[PDB]
Amino acid sequence: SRAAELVAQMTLDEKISFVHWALDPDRQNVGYLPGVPRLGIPELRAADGPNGIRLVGQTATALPAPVALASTFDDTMADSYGKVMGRDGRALNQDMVLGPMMNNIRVPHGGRNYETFSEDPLVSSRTAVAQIKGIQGAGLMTTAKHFAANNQENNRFSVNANVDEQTLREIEFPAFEASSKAGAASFMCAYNGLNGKPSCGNDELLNNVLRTQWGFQGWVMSDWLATPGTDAITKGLDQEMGVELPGDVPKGEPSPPAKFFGEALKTAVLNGTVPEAAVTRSAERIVGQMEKFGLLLATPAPRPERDKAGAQAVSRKVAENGAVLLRNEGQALPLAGDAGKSIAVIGPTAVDPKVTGLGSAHVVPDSAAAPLDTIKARAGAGATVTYETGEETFGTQIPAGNLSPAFNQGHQLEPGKAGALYDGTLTVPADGEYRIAVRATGGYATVQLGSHTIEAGQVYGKVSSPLLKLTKGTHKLTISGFAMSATPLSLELGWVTPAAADATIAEAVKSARKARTAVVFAYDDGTEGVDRPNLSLPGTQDKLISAVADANPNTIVVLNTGSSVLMPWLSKTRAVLDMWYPGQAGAEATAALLYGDVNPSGKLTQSFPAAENQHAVAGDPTSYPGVDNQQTYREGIHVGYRWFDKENVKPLFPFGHGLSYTSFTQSAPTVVRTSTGGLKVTVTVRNSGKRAGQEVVQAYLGASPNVTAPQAKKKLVGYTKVSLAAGEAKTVTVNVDRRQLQFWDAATDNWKTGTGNRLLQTGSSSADLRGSATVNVW
Ligand SMILES: OC[C@H]1O[C@@H](O)[C@H](O)[C@@H](O)[C@@H]1O
């Protein structure tokens, strides 16, 4: 390997150039390094993110949400997803993607739950490794993130999470451990603290666990402005990400200075307070990955062009395989015969599709079809398909009546500039619930109305419009923002009053009375940076669905929601199809699933609570979100379905749930120990219905009678998805790795096998387990 010898030839300045990301000269991505031309080491570029390459001013494939990929329960889908991402990044001049994210889904409100995989470590580990191998086999480096315990957005910049060792080793770490062992090029350390030190300054995490124990060969970068000090380079952090940015920086200006790993690091090396060996080691790790990826060849592999058609096909297939049919009463779905030829489509995401979540993972595709249009196509020319908005997101510009001083709507700022924008008062005509709508183009704005903060700008979608409970009278309103370099910032301030919502609802209801079938699209607003304030659909969408389902007895809800959501209207509907955020081909996939051209086969990767405050972290500020910047993961390993099982609570929908348009039968499982002490579980699955479909056979193991440490009531220990023609049977193998039969023994500081007679259950969801065997584990 040449990397150590090349670094040995570098000056201290040349070494320090690798350890802090600078701005992209092209002003598109997250970070750039200049390399060292005299040594044949090229530039390095990194872009977000976990569901496709995000570049300012350059579109790329917007894949379905990470949660949708995980809900396929299919490692081959993750491989395909990764190959598309890697090829797009290579084609678009990048060398790394900043993903995947693989934090556990712990908090139902967690803003970024859409951007990660599961509440279960096995599903997270399998999805992460298959995607990383796909991205890296296409030539692009990955960045497993956010190491570790970044399971919420609330106060992520300052909170410290105290997590016991067994919980870390069994729940949060497995996907990172598997990603390290699969050769992920890099890790990104988390904003939050872990067990008393910032993750990005935690030697136990980044050196002892990650390197001494797991053997990680790559480098660790910080999250954006998460580096805690210059000394962090001696604690396992190799690379500082972030600089101060008023907003956008024009092309041709210098990159703003690094805070801790630039000038300050040079000063600390030259005065002896940081060993030069630490800089050398970090540069060697980076350059070693560049070598492994072929970047140090005198003549490197030529970059590919985009394969837009193949990317569309994979995006479609993932959405078709990860959508979850939650409810389907009396074969309401698939739509067929007259029921499929007279439809009232309702909801804003039927015409402005919900393609990706909000935040750094947001991707704008070249184009995305509208579900209204793909439903119209599929229903056929003879059909009647109507459309009503149902749920307005902007409403109308707030009357000048209600604003003091008046707000100058529209143009705010000339390209480049930042500023305060507005300092004034909003007068509310009547106590009620109002959407307050902010529509920014050409930059970003931040609106503070009373205690509420609203961010608006491209990664936050076309409009930001939270429903706020406001009393009659005045409320403080301040605005500020910034323009991008090419484009002035323009900004509109609107509202949707209670009356305006009722009128839009009534118009939708009328269309539902007229059609045989009502298909209501409903969406949520999960974002990086803050958690959802509650688990309900935002706005007035509950009231909409309830009114439509009261008026039409054939109401189907299509969810474009990133995580769990409450469904108080559930019993009034006949079917609910969860498309997650389904990516650029989501509309095509949605029409195909609705008509049964594809048979739903996704399963949930997380538990949906039955009530706002009944879930694993509810009712305890020291567990969520923390107090005085401190939280403790008091549930331990009993998170997600493990918590519902421990507490004997029935969730709205359980882990592993997902219906099909066909039926399946399963035999009892047969089990044989493998040569490594794992298990090979065999189940014969028959499609006993009339349609081809896929089933996911899930294996759960009960507690060892020989272990006194915490154990889950049942643990997912393997799964295998199978495709069956109508009438067809296949004998399916479910592999159980030896590690799944073990627990983390916080005495021995090591894995220990949980021996003795244990219950093995097989079936098609955590709540539909028909097959069983006693397994004597040894
Ligand atoms: O965009 C750069 C980074 O921004 C941070 O706010 C996010 O936490 C990271 O996931 C992302 O990669």
GROMACS .gro file of N, CA, C and O and ligand atoms in nm, residues 30 48 54 98 112 115 145-146 156 188 191 223-224 241 360 528, ligand 1:
model
   76
   30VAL      N    1  -2.138   1.905  -0.025
   30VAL     CA    2  -2.108   1.932   0.115
   30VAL      C    3  -1.962   1.968   0.133
   30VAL      O    4  -1.932   2.066   0.204
   48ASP      N    5  -2.432   1.480   0.022
   48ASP     CA    6  -2.544   1.403   0.077
   48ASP      C    7  -2.615   1.332  -0.039
   48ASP      O    8  -2.595   1.369  -0.155
   54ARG      N    9  -2.764   1.473  -0.352
   54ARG     CA   10  -2.818   1.609  -0.340
   54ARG      C   11  -2.707   1.705  -0.377
   54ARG      O   12  -2.603   1.713  -0.311
   98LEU      N   13  -2.261   1.087   0.162
   98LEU     CA   14  -2.274   1.098   0.308
   98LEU      C   15  -2.395   1.018   0.354
   98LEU      O   16  -2.499   1.069   0.390
  112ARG      N   17  -3.593   1.244   1.177
  112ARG     CA   18  -3.521   1.177   1.068
  112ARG      C   19  -3.552   1.026   1.065
  112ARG      O   20  -3.481   0.947   1.004
  115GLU      N   21  -3.534   0.864   0.735
  115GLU     CA   22  -3.403   0.866   0.668
  115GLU      C   23  -3.321   0.748   0.717
  115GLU      O   24  -3.209   0.733   0.667
  145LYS      N   25  -2.355   0.678   0.910
  145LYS     CA   26  -2.384   0.790   1.001
  145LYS      C   27  -2.509   0.759   1.082
  145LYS      O   28  -2.590   0.675   1.039
  146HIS      N   29  -2.532   0.819   1.199
  146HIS     CA   30  -2.443   0.916   1.268
  146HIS      C   31  -2.396   0.842   1.394
  146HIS      O   32  -2.478   0.807   1.481
  156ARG      N   33  -3.032   1.792   1.943
  156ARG     CA   34  -2.918   1.702   1.906
  156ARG      C   35  -2.784   1.776   1.917
  156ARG      O   36  -2.683   1.711   1.943
  188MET      N   37  -1.938   0.897   0.998
  188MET     CA   38  -1.962   1.035   1.045
  188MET      C   39  -2.006   1.024   1.190
  188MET      O   40  -2.106   0.954   1.221
  191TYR      N   41  -2.382   1.450   1.623
  191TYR     CA   42  -2.391   1.573   1.707
  191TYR      C   43  -2.401   1.545   1.856
  191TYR      O   44  -2.345   1.621   1.934
  223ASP      N   45  -1.997   1.547   1.201
  223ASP     CA   46  -2.112   1.615   1.142
  223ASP      C   47  -2.085   1.766   1.130
  223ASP      O   48  -1.980   1.813   1.177
  224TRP      N   49  -2.178   1.838   1.071
  224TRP     CA   50  -2.146   1.976   1.028
  224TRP      C   51  -2.134   2.070   1.149
  224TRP      O   52  -2.230   2.096   1.222
  241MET      N   53  -1.586   1.856   0.962
  241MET     CA   54  -1.676   1.908   0.859
  241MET      C   55  -1.748   2.033   0.905
  241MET      O   56  -1.789   2.037   1.022
  360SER      N   57  -3.125   1.759   0.489
  360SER     CA   58  -3.009   1.734   0.403
  360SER      C   59  -3.024   1.616   0.309
  360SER      O   60  -2.951   1.608   0.210
  528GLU      N   61  -3.515   1.683   0.918
  528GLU     CA   62  -3.396   1.702   0.998
  528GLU      C   63  -3.410   1.831   1.080
  528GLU      O   64  -3.465   1.929   1.029
  779LIG     O1   65  -2.525   1.822   0.490
  779LIG     C1   66  -2.419   1.780   0.573
  779LIG     C2   67  -2.469   1.718   0.705
  779LIG     O2   68  -2.561   1.809   0.764
  779LIG     C3   69  -2.595   1.773   0.896
  779LIG     O3   70  -2.692   1.869   0.938
  779LIG     C4   71  -2.662   1.634   0.896
  779LIG     O4   72  -2.679   1.594   1.029
  779LIG     C5   73  -2.574   1.532   0.821
  779LIG     O5   74  -2.645   1.407   0.805
  779LIG     C6   75  -2.542   1.585   0.682
  779LIG     O6   76  -2.459   1.489   0.610
   0.00000   0.00000   0.00000
